[PDB]
Ligand binder design. Structure first.
Ligand code: CA
Ligand code: CA
Length: 279
């Protein structure tokens, strides 16, 4: 399949080179996989989700996404126009309030929820969790991410937007998950992207068009706009049978575009998520 005039990030993950406009992908499109978006929620009614999104848990008074952040991230995973995995099932877990903030205890609960809840769901191609969030280092938060991974979920987390070593941020610094940095359309490390030895992979994160609340769309930037690219790619590869929840981050790194990025500090991987699609 080919989506012409795709958002640059989708085009980028299906090319060995920057500057293309077409997103090439296998038409299976992550069908039969499930991605939990742990965030501010998902506006499941957005036409772009085609009924494939639903809220499954909230830690606040409502399950509504009153911010937009979670809806944007979910859109990059699996919306029709803006998504990597256009036929995946999306599950919303609202651990962040409508200002985009959340307590560590709640974020941990949300992770533990997904580890259990997946057993109530029909996801024959496997399960992914996308965590576009984080704060300062916490062993408790890291441990929760490690548990979720261990339970058989592909966990992808944002590296953070501090232009610093991700070792001092959680869940970014948990080694056993997939820690995602951000790049821009000219293959530069995004100016804000964290870096460091803990990063597994980079994804498109600067000027990312996706879904927004009120049935709208907008372009925003962050390591968290890169995280769902990798989560969606994982789901896509899992549907294809190329890899598993336990091994997908490694597989993505194995098959990444190598050395294409600039302003990568010594000691940080120079690896850009790539679907290696051959028609
Ligand atoms: Ca290249
Ligand atoms: Ca890792």
């Amino acid at each position: 399949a080919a989506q012409t005039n795709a958002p640059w990030g989708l085009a980028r993950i299906s090319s060995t080179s920057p500057g293309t406009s077409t997103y090439y992908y296998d038409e299976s499109a992550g069908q039969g996989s499930c991605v939990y978006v742990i965030d501010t929620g998902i506006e499941a009614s957005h036409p772009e989700f085609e009924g494939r999104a639903q809220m499954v848990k909230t830690y606040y008074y409502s399950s509504r996404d009153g911010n937009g952040h979670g809806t944007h991230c979910a859109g990059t995973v699996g919306s029709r126009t803006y998504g990597v995995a256009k036929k995946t099932q999306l599950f919303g877990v609202k651990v962040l309030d409508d200002n985009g903030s959340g307590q560590y205890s709640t974020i941990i609960a949300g992770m533990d929820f997904v580890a259990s809840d997946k057993n109530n769901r029909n996801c024959p191609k496997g399960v992914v969790a996308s965590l576009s969030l984080g704060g300062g280092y916490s062993s408790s938060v890291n441990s929760a991410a490690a548990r979720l991974q261990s339970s058989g979920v592909m966990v992808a987390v944002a590296a953070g937007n501090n232009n610093a070593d991700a070792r001092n941020y959680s869940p970014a610094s948990e080694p056993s998950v997939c820690t995602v940095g951000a790049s821009d359309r000219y293959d530069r490390r995004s100016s804000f992207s964290n870096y460091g030895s803990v990063l597994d992979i980079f994804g498109p994160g600067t000027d990312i068009l996706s879904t927004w609340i009120g049935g709208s769309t907008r372009s925003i930037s962050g390591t968290s706009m890169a995280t769902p690219h990798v989560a969606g790619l994982a789901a896509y590869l899992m549907t294809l049978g190329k890899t598993t929840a336990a091994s997908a981050c490694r597989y993505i790194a194995d098959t990444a575009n190598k050395g294409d990025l600039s302003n990568i500090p010594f000691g940080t991987v120079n690896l850009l998520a790539y679907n290696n699609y051959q028609a």
